[PDB]
XYZ file of C-alpha atoms in Angstrom:
229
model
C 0.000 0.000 0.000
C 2.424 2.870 -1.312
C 0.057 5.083 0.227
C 2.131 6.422 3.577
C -0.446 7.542 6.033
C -1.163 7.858 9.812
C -3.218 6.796 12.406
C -3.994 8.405 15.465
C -5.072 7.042 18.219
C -7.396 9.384 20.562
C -9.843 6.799 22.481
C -9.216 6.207 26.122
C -9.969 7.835 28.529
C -6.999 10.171 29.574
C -7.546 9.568 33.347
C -4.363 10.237 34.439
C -4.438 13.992 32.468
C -7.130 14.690 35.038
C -8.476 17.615 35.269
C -8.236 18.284 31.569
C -9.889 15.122 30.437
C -13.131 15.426 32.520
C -14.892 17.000 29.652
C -12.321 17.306 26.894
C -11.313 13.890 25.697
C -6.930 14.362 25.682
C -6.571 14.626 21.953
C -8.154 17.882 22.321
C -6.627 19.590 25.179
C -5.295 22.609 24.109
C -1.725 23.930 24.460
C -0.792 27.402 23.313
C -4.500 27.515 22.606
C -4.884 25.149 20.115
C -5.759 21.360 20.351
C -2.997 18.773 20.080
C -3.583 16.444 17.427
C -4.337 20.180 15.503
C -0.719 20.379 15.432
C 0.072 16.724 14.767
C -1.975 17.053 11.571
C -0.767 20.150 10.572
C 2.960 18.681 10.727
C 1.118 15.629 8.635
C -0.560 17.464 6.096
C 2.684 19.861 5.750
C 4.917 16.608 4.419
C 2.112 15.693 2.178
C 0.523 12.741 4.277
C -2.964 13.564 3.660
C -4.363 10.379 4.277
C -5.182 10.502 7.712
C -7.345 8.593 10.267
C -7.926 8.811 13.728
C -9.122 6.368 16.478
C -12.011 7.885 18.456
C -14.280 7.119 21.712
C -14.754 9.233 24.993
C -16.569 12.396 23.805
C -15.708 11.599 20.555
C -18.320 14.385 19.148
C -15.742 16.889 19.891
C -13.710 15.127 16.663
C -16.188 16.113 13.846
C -15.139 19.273 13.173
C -12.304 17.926 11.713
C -13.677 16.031 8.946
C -14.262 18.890 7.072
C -11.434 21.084 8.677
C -8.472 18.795 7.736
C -10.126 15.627 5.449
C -9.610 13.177 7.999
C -11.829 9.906 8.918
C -12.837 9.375 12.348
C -13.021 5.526 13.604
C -15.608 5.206 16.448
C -13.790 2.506 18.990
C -16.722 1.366 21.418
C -14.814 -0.352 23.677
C -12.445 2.041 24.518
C -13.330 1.922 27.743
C -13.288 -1.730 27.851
C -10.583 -3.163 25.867
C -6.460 -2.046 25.858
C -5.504 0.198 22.775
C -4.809 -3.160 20.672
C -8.428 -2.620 19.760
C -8.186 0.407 18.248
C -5.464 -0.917 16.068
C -7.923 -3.787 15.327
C -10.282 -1.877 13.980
C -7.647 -0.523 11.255
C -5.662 -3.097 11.090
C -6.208 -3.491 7.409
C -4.759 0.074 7.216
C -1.593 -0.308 8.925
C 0.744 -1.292 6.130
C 2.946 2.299 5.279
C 1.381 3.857 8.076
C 2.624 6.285 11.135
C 0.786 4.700 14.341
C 0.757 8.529 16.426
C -0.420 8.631 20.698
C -2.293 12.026 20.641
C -1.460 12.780 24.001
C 2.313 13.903 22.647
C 3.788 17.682 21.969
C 5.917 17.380 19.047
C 8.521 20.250 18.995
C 9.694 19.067 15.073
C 8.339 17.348 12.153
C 9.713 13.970 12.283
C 7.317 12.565 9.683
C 8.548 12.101 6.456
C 6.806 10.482 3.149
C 9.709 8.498 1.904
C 10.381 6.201 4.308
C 11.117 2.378 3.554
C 11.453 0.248 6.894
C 9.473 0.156 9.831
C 10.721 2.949 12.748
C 10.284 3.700 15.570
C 11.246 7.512 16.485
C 12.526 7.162 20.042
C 13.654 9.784 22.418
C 16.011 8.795 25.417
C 14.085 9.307 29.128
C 15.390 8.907 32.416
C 13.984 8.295 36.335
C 10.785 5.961 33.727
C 7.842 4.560 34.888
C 5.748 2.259 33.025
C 7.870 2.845 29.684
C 9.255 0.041 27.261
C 12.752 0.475 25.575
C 14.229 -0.412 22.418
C 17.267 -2.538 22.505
C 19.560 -2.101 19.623
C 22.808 -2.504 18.271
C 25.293 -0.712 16.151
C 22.558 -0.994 12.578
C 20.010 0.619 14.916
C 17.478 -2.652 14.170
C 15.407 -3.551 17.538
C 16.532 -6.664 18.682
C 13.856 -6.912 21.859
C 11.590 -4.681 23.686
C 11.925 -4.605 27.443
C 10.099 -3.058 30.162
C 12.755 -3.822 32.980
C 14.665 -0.415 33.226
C 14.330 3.152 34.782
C 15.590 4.916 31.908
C 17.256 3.918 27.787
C 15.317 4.926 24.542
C 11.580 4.652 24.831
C 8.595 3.583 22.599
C 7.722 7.736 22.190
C 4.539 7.720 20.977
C 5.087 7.942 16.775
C 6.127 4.496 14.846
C 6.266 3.993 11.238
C 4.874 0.265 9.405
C 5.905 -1.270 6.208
C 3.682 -3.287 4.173
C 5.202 -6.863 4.948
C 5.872 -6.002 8.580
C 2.326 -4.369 8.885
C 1.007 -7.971 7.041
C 3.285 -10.202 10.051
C 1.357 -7.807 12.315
C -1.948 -7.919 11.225
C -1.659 -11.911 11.487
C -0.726 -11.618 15.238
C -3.466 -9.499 15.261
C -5.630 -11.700 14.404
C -4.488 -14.496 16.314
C -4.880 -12.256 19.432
C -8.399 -11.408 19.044
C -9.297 -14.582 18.468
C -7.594 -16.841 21.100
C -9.191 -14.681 24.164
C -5.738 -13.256 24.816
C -6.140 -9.767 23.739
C -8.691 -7.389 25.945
C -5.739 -5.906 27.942
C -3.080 -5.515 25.162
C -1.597 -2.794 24.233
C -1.386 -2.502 20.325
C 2.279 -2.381 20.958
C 2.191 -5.592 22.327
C 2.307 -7.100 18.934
C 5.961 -6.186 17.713
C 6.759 -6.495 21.641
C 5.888 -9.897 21.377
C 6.862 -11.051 18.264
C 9.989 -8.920 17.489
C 11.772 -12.212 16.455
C 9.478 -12.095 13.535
C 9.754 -8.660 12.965
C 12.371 -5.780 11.033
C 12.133 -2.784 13.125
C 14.593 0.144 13.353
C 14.840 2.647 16.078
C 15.383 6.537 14.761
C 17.142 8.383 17.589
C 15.188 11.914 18.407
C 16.887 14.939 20.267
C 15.888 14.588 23.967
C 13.100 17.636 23.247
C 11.649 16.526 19.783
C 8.671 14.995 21.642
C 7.331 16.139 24.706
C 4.862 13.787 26.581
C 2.154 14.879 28.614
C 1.283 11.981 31.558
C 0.098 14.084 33.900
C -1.598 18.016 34.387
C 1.822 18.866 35.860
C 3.770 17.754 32.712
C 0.753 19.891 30.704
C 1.252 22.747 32.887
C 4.785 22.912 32.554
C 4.704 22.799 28.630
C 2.301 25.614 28.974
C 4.991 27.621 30.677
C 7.552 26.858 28.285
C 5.626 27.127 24.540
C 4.873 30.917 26.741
């Protein structure tokens, strides 16, 4: 599918961003006065990837305005509140091959995305004093030899990904597997290269400590507040 495009995923709940999530679903926070996945597409759109769909659930009327504002589909997940993020994958998972998998609860200070890439990537900034994170172990041809969760700081999974058609088929296939072999309602989407990175050609693209800021918490919103001034 030489057809590079991106998924967003902006579904759960964003219960840890309280009290910005209680009635604005964390996609749609604003920072600088202006939603976040605004300037996610934007930085899309800008490197010609027009082709872009996004993963929606808790208040996900807020979205439609930006059907006709940007072009983008909305996918309604239902169990968002139910089922792990490997869900909302699921119900694209036909869409996956050449596409950017993007959290929406991410600042990005640059435009990483590019239209003319050829492997699968992962754009991973290094974090220290982690909690809950997974890391990327690599070697000297950058190509992600395991995923880990056991460490307090290394390159992490950041939030933006990149899938080529026959690692987005392998994944698909796991996918399937997953949903249907009642071992899949609390995976994470990421779960599937996680566990099955034997089978899979991924390469980690090393970002500048401040290319991606991530917002866990009101505090970290707060703070990135203060600094885009």
């Amino acid at each position: 599918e030489i057809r590079v495009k991106a998924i967003i995923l902006a579904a759960g709940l964003g219960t840890r961003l309280r009290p910005l999530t209680e009635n604005t679903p964390k996609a749609l926070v604003q920072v600088n006065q202006k939603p976040l996945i605004e300037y996610q597409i934007e930085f899309l759109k800008e490197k010609g990837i027009n082709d872009i769909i996004i993963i929606v659930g808790y208040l996900k009327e807020q979205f439609d305005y930006l059907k006709e504002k940007y072009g983008v589909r909305l996918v309604f997940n239902d169990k968002y509140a139910d089922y792990n993020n490997f869900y909302s994958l699921y119900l694209v998972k036909e869409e996956l091959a050449n596409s950017y998998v993007i959290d929406a609860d991410n600042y990005l200070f640059k435009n990483m995305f590019r239209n003319d890439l050829t492997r699968s990537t992962y754009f991973s900034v290094y974090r220290e004093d982690c909690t809950n994170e997974w890391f990327l172990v690599y070697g000297d041809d950058y190509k992600v030899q395991d995923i880990i969760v056991d460490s307090k700081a290394g390159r992490i999974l950041s939030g933006v990904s990149f899938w080529d058609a026959p690692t987005a088929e392998k994944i698909v296939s796991f996918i399937d597997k997953a949903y249907v072999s009642g071992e899949f309602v609390d995976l994470y989407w990421d779960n599937m290269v996680k566990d099955n990175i034997k089978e899979l050609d991924v390469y980690v693209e090393e970002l500048e400590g401040n290319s991606i800021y991530e917002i866990d918490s009101v505090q970290d919103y707060r703070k990135l507040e203060e600094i885009l001034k």
